[PDB]
């Protein structure tokens, strides 16, 4: 059974965030929400599709109807700044979803700026080739990368960054593409494309 | 108050088998279903085992079936996770969990259940990677021009790197490692600098790994 949230939501301070979380038949399930802050374990702020717990500040609302619940955090402040991540049940089997950022706008948004580079000679001389998509000076500090082979979406040998702050406040991550030498040369065009915050950008080398 | 303590994380090989530790305190365990719940980092959570408030009950992942056995001593107050044949995807912050509902399994009914505390986690980090210097590959240049250097391939962190030794700084960004799934980090370098320079201006980046000893130049040039 699969629980799919929304990588990212970003929200000003006062504004309503939401969080929605889909999966087959969700009405039929009970949801429970849980806020995790880096480095800290997760805190259970809905349970039951809607209720909540004590020492819970009441801005914080769950429901849960058809294939969707959606956790709603009004007012939101900084301290809501956090990953939230959607919870149900399976038999005796328990499934969390994909898990979503709430950014608290705190300094003015940002496009990134990417840079992408090929494989080096000298690399596909040892028989290995990498992409490098290296993305710079954007907030949220939220990305998502996806890589193409000319026109079809590849998954596999891609590893990419969590984001994580520049000294100049805004963030910085990098994706890379492993491939074969061989896999390289036999497409006509690669790209590297970076969403944030709605937006995507994209980069594309060739071999040539 | 109630309390979750958990315990035996640590860095093994592939293979190997590791048990967990999870201390109750301010209350029984034996009056709760509790769970474990694990989190690769920078990743989501995920759902490992739970066993009932009876021990009379277990339940696994499938990703974990047939390795894992999730037991509760008594006595102690203490649950415990018998990890064996470790993989490498089992790299994990491994959480404690209390569920306050769930009581005899399989559900009669649909369940309603949640986790009302967790502990602080204990980390296990399953990997063959050993001490290893990086490769280092020039990343050419193709109105400024972006250039770099690739670390490919290195253990453990850090390496750093500098450009002219440190006498070119302008325009330098050096990026936080990924760490892949072999347990290997890369890393890249980039400077970028005017398009009309190419020529005559010099470029070489310094990349340091001191665990391996490794302090290799690569000159970076246009074509």
């Known amino acids: 059974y699969e629980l799919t949230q929304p990588p990212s939501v970003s929200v000003s301070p006062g504004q309503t965030a939401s969080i929605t979380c889909s999966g087959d038949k969700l009405g039929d399930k009970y949801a429970c929400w849980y806020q995790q802050k880096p480095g800290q374990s997760p805190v259970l702020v809905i349970y039951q599709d809607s209720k909540r717990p004590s020492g819970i500040p009441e801005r914080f609302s769950g429901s849960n109807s058809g294939n969707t619940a959606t956790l709603t955090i009004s007012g939101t402040q900084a301290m809501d700044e956090a990953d939230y991540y959607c919870?149900?049940?399976?038999?005796?089997?328990?499934?969390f979803g994909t898990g979503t950022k709430v950014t608290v706008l705190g300094q003015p948004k940002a496009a990134p700026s990417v840079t992408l580079f090929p494989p080096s000679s000298e690399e596909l001389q040892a028989n290995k080739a990498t992409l490098v998509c290296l993305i710079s000076d954007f907030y949220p500090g939220a990305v998502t990368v996806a890589w193409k082979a000319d026109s079809s979406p590849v998954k596999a040998g891609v590893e990419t960054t969590t984001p994580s702050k520049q000294s100049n406040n805004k963030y910085a991550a990098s994706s890379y593409l492993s491939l074969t030498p061989e896999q390289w040369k036999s497409h006509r065009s690669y790209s590297c494309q970076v969403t944030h915050e709605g937006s995507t950008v994209e980069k594309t080398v060739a071999p040539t | 108050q109630v309390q979750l303590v958990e315990s035996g994380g640590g860095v093994v090989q592939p293979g190997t088998s590791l048990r967990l530790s999870c201390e109750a305190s301010?209350?029984?365990?034996?009056?709760?279903?509790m769970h474990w719940v694990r989190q690769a980092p920078g990743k989501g959570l995920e759902w490992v085992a739970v066993?009932?408030?009876?021990?009379?009950?277990?339940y696994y992942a499938d990703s974990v079936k047939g390795r894992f056995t999730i037991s509760r001593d008594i006595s102690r107050n203490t649950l415990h996770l018998h990890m064996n044949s470790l993989r490498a995807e089992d790299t994990a912050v491994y959480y404690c969990a209390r569920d306050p509902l769930t009581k005899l399994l399989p559900f009669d009914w649909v369940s309603g259940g949640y986790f009302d505390y967790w502990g602080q986690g204990t980390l296990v980090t399953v990997s063959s990677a050993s001490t290893k210097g990086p490769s280092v590959f020039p990343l050419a240049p193709s109105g400024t021009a972006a250039l770099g250097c690739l670390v490919k391939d290195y253990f453990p962190e850090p390496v750093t790197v500098s450009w002219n030794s440190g006498a070119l700084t302008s325009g330098v960004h050096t990026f936080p490692a990924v760490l892949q799934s072999s347990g290997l980090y890369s890393l890249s370098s980039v400077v970028t600098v005017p398009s009309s320079s190419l020529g005559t201006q010099t470029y070489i980046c310094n990349v340091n790994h001191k665990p391996s000893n490794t302090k290799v130049d690569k000159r970076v040039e246009p074509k």
């Open positions: 919870q149900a049940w399976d038999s005796s089997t328990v499934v």
């Open positions: 066993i009932t408030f009876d021990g009379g009950y277990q």
């Open positions: 301010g209350f029984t365990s034996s009056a709760y279903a």
